[PDB]
Amino acid sequence: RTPPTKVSILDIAGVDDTLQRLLKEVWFPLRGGEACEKMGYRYDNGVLLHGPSGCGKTTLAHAIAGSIGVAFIPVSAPSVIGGTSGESEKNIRDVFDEAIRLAPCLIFLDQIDAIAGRRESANKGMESRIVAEIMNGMDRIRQNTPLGKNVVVLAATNRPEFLDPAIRRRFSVEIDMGMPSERAREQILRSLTRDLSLADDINFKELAKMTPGYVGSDLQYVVKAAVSESFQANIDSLLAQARAKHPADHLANVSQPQRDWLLLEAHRDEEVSWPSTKITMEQFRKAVSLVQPASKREGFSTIPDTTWSHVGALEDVRKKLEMSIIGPIKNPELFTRVGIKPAAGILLWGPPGCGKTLVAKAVANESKANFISIKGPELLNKYVGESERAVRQLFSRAKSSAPCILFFDQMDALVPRRDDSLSDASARVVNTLLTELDGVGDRSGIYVIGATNRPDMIDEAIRRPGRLGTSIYVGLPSAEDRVKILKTLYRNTVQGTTDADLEKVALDLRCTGFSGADLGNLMQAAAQACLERVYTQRQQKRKEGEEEIEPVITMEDWEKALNEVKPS
Amino acid sequence: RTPPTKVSILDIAGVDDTLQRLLKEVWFPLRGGEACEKMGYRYDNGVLLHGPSGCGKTTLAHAIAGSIGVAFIPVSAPSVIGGTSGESEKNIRDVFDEAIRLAPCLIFLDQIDAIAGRRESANKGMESRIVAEIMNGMDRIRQNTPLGKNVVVLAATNRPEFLDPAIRRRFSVEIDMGMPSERAREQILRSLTRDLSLADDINFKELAKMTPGYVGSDLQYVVKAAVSESFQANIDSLLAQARAKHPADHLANVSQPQRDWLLLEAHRDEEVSWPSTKITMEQFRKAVSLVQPASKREGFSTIPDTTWSHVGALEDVRKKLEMSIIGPIKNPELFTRVGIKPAAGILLWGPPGCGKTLVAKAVANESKANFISIKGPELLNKYVGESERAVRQLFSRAKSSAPCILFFDQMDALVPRRDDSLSDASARVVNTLLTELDGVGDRSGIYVIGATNRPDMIDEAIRRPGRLGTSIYVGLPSAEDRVKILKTLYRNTVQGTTDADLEKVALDLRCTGFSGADLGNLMQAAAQACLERVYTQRQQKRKEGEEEIEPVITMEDWEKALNEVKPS
Numbered sequence A, B: 001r002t003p004p005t006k007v008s009i010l011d012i013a014g015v016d017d018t019l020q021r022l023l024k025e026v027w028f029p030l031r032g033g034e035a036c037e038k039m040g041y042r043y044d045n046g047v048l049l050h051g052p053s054g055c056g057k058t059t060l061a062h063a064i065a066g067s068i069g070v071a072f073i074p075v076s077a078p079s080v081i082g083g084t085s086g087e088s089e090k091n092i093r094d095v096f097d098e099a100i101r102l103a104p105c106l107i108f109l110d111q112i113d114a115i116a117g118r119r120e121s122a123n124k125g126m127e128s129r130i131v132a133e134i135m136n137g138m139d140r141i142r143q144n145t146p147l148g149k150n151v152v153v154l155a156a157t158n159r160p161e162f163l164d165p166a167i168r169r170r171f172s173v174e175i176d177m178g179m180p181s182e183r184a185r186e187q188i189l190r191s192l193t194r195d196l197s198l199a200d201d202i203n204f205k206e207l208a209k210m211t212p213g214y215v216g217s218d219l220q221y222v223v224k225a226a227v228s229e230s231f232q233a234n235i236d237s238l239l240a241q242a243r244a245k246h247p248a249d250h251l252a253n254v255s256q257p258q259r260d261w262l263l264l265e266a267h268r269d270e271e272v273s274w275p276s277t278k279i280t281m282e283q284f285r286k287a288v289s290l291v292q293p294a295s296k297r298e299g300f301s302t303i304p305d306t307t308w309s310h311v312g313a314l315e316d317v318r319k320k321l322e323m324s325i326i327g328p329i330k331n332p333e334l335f336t337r338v339g340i341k342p343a344a345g346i347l348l349w350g351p352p353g354c355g356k357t358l359v360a361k362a363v364a365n366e367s368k369a370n371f372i373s374i375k376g377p378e379l380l381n382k383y384v385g386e387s388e389r390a391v392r393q394l395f396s397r398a399k400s401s402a403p404c405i406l407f408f409d410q411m412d413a414l415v416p417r418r419d420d421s422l423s424d425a426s427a428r429v430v431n432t433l434l435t436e437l438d439g440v441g442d443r444s445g446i447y448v449i450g451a452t453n454r455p456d457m458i459d460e461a462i463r464r465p466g467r468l469g470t471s472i473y474v475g476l477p478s479a480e481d482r483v484k485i486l487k488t489l490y491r492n493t494v495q496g497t498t499d500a501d502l503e504k505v506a507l508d509l510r511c512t513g514f515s516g517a518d519l520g521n522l523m524q525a526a527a528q529a530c531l532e533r534v535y536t537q538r539q540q541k542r543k544e545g546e547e548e549i550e551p552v553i554t555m556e557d558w559e560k561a562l563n564e565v566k567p568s
């Protein structure tokens, strides 16, 4: 005999539409058994749950069993496999036999791709035989049903493509338990927090927004982490209290952790009352920093510390960018009301990497959105079929994690091979690209930014609205801007600040023919030269004559570094 | 019923940070049970302890149990396995059932890779079933918990790669019990010596200091080795005594070991009184020399006697190296104040056998930091999913014992498999490597040095600053160095040594454009020419005229060999 378990039904949320459908399909046959028998009409047999790992498939099934109050028979992937070639099949029979005999019940097949994979991919005579056993069992249920047998077979899988097309046909109902979005994460957070006394400064909405690739289990842990962090105050109190009851002078201490441990060991039968404290928003942020995501090894690319303050001038461009990208992301309400469709893509042309990197990253950071950077010819192969498949993969990855900015650096290679007939490989890639661009735009969230140092030879087809229609021209040469950049870089140091020196450096001819990346390099070069001076002087004095170290940087260091460094 | 044991908590030391973390996670749920029940918040369930064998994992667990005063349930690797196919599973259930019933308790799973290894590596139907039983038990605990059930599951393993990824996910907290310290070894030595009568000249502190990568088991053996060494005096005494009782003249001897054996055999029923002697410091040093752990594949690697005085010239390279490695280790204050992130790695490229290994050791030695050397194909295994986990392990070990220099010799194997699509295994490994490199930059202490005799096909991604960005070019063209090499090779011969000849040979133009391998070949070539002279002369004289053979080598042989041989 196998009775049901006690799991919390108030734990799962964000699955409103799907749970409703499940309820409709499962409630009538299980709960009103007498009614279905009298009518003579047939019902739903198999319910397949799919989606990514940790999506709450196992929990949903467990919850449903507990809530209805029916008998739960858990069939895990390797639980039926035995030692001898026959015991496995015998067990499958017994499972189905006992199940049909006792009703109402819920049979749950957790991780089904391990038992019933494609019969062409399995060259073993045991695996094919097991699939056959399942099929036979399914038929037996169908025949017995009009008497008073009420059993529903639930199943969970992570990938539908790995399953045998034959079993797919047998199963009738399918529920998609998809990716936890911003809204979904918010809901999950609320479910977990339900039993906790939250403070007024805590905004679960803010937490959800700044939580990219976290799953239901991860969020569960973030909540637990916050709990431990809050109870550090009580630990400090106990330490002070212990050192007063049992002093032990300085004999109990060799280090800090060991002394704390020893005091607690001495106490033993001492019971203490713990005050119920509230958690802060700061504690949650601390907890979030210490937690790890799931999709971290893929094409994620983290957003740098680049803001608008790092970009000198280009105020007109800044405003235009805000309108296009920040407008639809932050204000969807505004766009729906007026009547226009959100953006798809923009194109940047002019100076190089320095200008492009500062633009691409600044906009991306500000929106607090994801960023992916694919640079020029670092995609092409000698073979005929991986290049196109790779491009498809990039867009799929981008689609999965929205909001995201997809950045294409140096497009002068791929695009001009259309106007004149030359290569076949280049033709295929560009055509796939055009195709991918047109496809996305209705659902949005994915904004494509293209950049090139050369605007002349480009195909007009790519330029067309809906693809990369917004052509933004970028230019960097101006003195006032350079001074601002120098100040911004030298702002992040921590006495001697020296403003006059910064202005003079900017005035020089060599500085005029520079870029953002060049100025950064100049700063680093000056720092290195200064270190050389400090090292040579200090070592000479210490050995011949221990003194203090001086991290101060003067003009002589800047001048020498300036003389050597060249642009691009 | 199973009550706690009485083990000394003052025995384990050197684990300050780790013990503190363990305290935080284990103290609150076990000690203040009433408080956690009232609040309704959830806590930590599983704590996994990893690291090498004899690191004190079993002792730490035992100590923690005794110190807190909770019930200790020891579950060893083969303690739950029975005779029939069902008794094993029944026992696992009973363990979890009794454990949840009685609280507060600590369940300790010692050596878990024997019970729950990878389910793909286990083709048995019993092993997979046992893993399933553990999973089911884990879930049962989680459900029961809000009532008043307080049980923490501790576990110890020697290798994280062998564990099933499924159980890894179930366990939440992980503690790394890495490299044993100087203080810790001192303590272990004292524990073992406890029953022995040590002399006054023995300083256990000195032993511990000069014992780098030895574990608890190794130290145990060093003590045993000392015992055998002392009892050699008694052996000599018995030998002399035996040769007096039963002389047997010279009939009992053909060799030395055999005669000794024969005498003892004759005696049989002769009982002798053994005097209790004290061990010396000299005997311990002798014992230490004969002991060897080797640790891992390469394991621990002590720093050689290589300084800057062993390297001829390359003064520019020396200064650059000092800046990068010695700069951040010795002067962290300087780097934080200026504003730049510490080094992560450098690359050494040039001609075959120029002394790349020697330069690497010199830098490491000078910083008085640790050194690990992993050479080319001495990394690859037969397994697939273990390669990536092994790389992760290396970085974890390096992180634990910082400051350390991680040296990769002959990188020509791993790096070129990016520019052209080879396979999937190579792709995963290199991507994991890039990931590991990016992570280490702010935390630092671990500086990665790469060396290769071939620079052509390498991915630019690895070359980027922050990874192996600093490309240092090395060569070998100095006269003084060549003389030293010639002397070193001609040192291993055994009359006529001749120093003047060696210097002149080095001076020649043909010698200037050479390498270490070339000089070795020249020496061999000269030896061959000399043999020809000896053979022709000896045969002519013996036949026409048996005389003696002359192994002497003059300058004429060297000159002829020198004329013919060409470089590479």
Ligand SMILES: Nc1ncnc2c1ncn2[C@@H]1O[C@H](COP(=O)(O)OP(=O)(O)OP(=O)(O)O)[C@@H](O)[C@H]1O
Pocket (backbone or CB within 6 Å): A011, A012, A013, A052, A053, A054, A055, A056, A057, A058, A059, A060, A156, A158, A188, A191, A215, A216, A217, A218, A220
């Ligand atoms: N949608 C969700 N809402 C609340 N909690 C969740 C959700 N999804 C997962 N969790 C938490 O994560 C845990 C894992 O859930 P579960 O094992 O059901 O996921 P899964 O999709 O079945 O994973 P797998 O299929 O790989 O076993 C649950 O115990 C739950 O605490």
Ligand SMILES: Nc1ncnc2c1ncn2[C@@H]1O[C@H](COP(=O)(O)OP(=O)(O)OP(=O)(O)O)[C@@H](O)[C@H]1O
Pocket (backbone or CB within 6 Å): B011, B012, B013, B052, B053, B054, B055, B056, B057, B058, B059, B060, B156, B157, B158, B180, B184, B187, B188, B191, B216, B217
């Ligand atoms: N860190 C340490 N401090 C003091 N003594 C130690 C330490 N580590 C080991 N020892 C000594 O060595 C013995 C072995 O310890 P223990 O069995 O806990 O190591 P282990 O890591 O659990 O080994 P394994 O996991 O292979 O069983 C202990 O009884 C102790 O006397």
Ligand SMILES: Nc1ncnc2c1ncn2[C@@H]1O[C@H](COP(=O)(O)OP(=O)(O)OP(=O)(O)O)[C@@H](O)[C@H]1O
Pocket (backbone or CB within 6 Å): B353, B354, B355, B356, B357, B358, B484, B485, B488, B516, B517
């Ligand atoms: N197997 C060895 N490992 C390290 N040092 C060696 C070895 N054999 C000789 N040496 C030392 O190095 C000098 C010889 O240099 P060699 O031509 O072997 O180049 P190397 O870089 O030291 O060795 P390798 O090229 O094998 O790394 C000698 O002075 C000798 O003392």
